[model samples]
Target: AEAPADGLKMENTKMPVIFNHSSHSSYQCADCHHPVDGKENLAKCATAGCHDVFDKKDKSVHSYYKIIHDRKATTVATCMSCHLEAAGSDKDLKKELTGCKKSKCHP
Candidate 1:
């Protein structure tokens, strides 16, 4: 009765991203879901007063877009950075790695 663990599905975005946690088993959960306020007890992104804004334009607020798409020069924890790195210098792959892939992450 058990299905293979494909990982967690994040449906809050325009395109749902399936985070393959099993593929990233080598890394610790805190690597991405960073602990807040000196507490190791991490929570979901939209929990309570946390990243609950779906359409706020303020760049400072870590809304869903900011959290996943913010391009911090040194931060490799974002979807854009991760996909780009995985695609390397391959232009075709990089092009397909767009956040809104119709048949892939985006509907």
Candidate 2:
């Protein structure tokens, strides 16, 4: 099935969130995550075009972005961001990743 286009088209705005990346991305990190001013400071990243903040009930590390814009669109948390295991175990990895796809941490 195809995702029906709705609401506004997802736009790509520039940002400043450069990670060490070797630990996070296997392919080119810049392919998915880009920098605006070329600084690439992930902590200071302001990529509000796609994954906006969720409600208080759904807040996470990116909650600060929510408060700033007050219900603005947010960057959708990616699978690799939360799925990669801390201990590098697949069981541990799946356990952390299975629930978020529904956007509610249940399990």
Candidate 3:
């Protein structure tokens, strides 16, 4: 099944974040779409068994907020940690990729 290639905005976040799946054409579906019951169902990230925690103070792996914002969880790196590593040695790219205002993933 196909998903939105671009313009998929999630406003539930305190500050809405924008994600474009089109750029990750090189990545396998399973890279981000973890399977349920050994099947590819594309379950939502906040399902009970997944990143379900909503408490900002928890900072646990199960925290839906941490899954996207935390950088220390090495098992499943957040967008920041991965993008941070990928943006080495380039000043403009680092800011645009990780910057609060110029972030390409967010507004």
Candidate 4:
């Protein structure tokens, strides 16, 4: 419940991403950790019944990869969705955040 650290290093995946609360504190928590079935309790993204799928080719709604790298401009607003909007013409940032080989999101 106390997740307001400056940077959260998540190593669940092979890339290992670092989430910075200071940079994204402006947005609502629901934007990322959203409620399911109209419930107010925001669930973790990797939890079961969510984006827990790990198969690389799996493109279902619950795939971890698709939930993050689905599209740059879309309604669902995946991780890359907001990042793309924030990057706004910054090709370098776009490529780095979404690019598999780059660091920033992956190391």
Off by over 4 Å in 2: 1-20, 34-52, 56-77, 80-90, 96-107
Output the worst ten-in-a-row residue range by lDDT, candidate 1: 98-107
Tens-place lDDT per residue, model 3, 1-107, is: 77666877766557778787887667677666756688986777877868888787877667887777775545556777767777887998788787777678664
For candidate 4, write residues 37-93 as lDDT tens digits.
787655567788788998878998878888887765354678777777767787787
Ranked candidates (lDDT, high to low): 4, 3, 1, 2
Model 4 lDDT, full chain set = 0.73
lDDT of 1 at 55: 74
- Candidate 3, residue 11: CA error in Å? 2.5
TM-score of 1: 0.71
Q: Report model 4's TM-score to 2 decimal places.
A: 0.79
Tens-digit per-residue lDDT, 1-107, candidate 1:
12237867888755677766665666666666677798764577866577777774755455767667665526437666666676688766766664455424453
Candidate 1 vs candidate 3: which has greater lDDT? 3
Greater-TM-score candidate between 1 and 3: 3
Pick by lDDT: 1 or 4, better one = 4
State how far residue 33 of model 4 sits from its true place (Å).
1.6
Listed in order, each prediction's TM-score against the native is 0.71, 0.27, 0.79, 0.79
Model 2 CA RMSD to the hidden true structure, in angstroms: 14.3
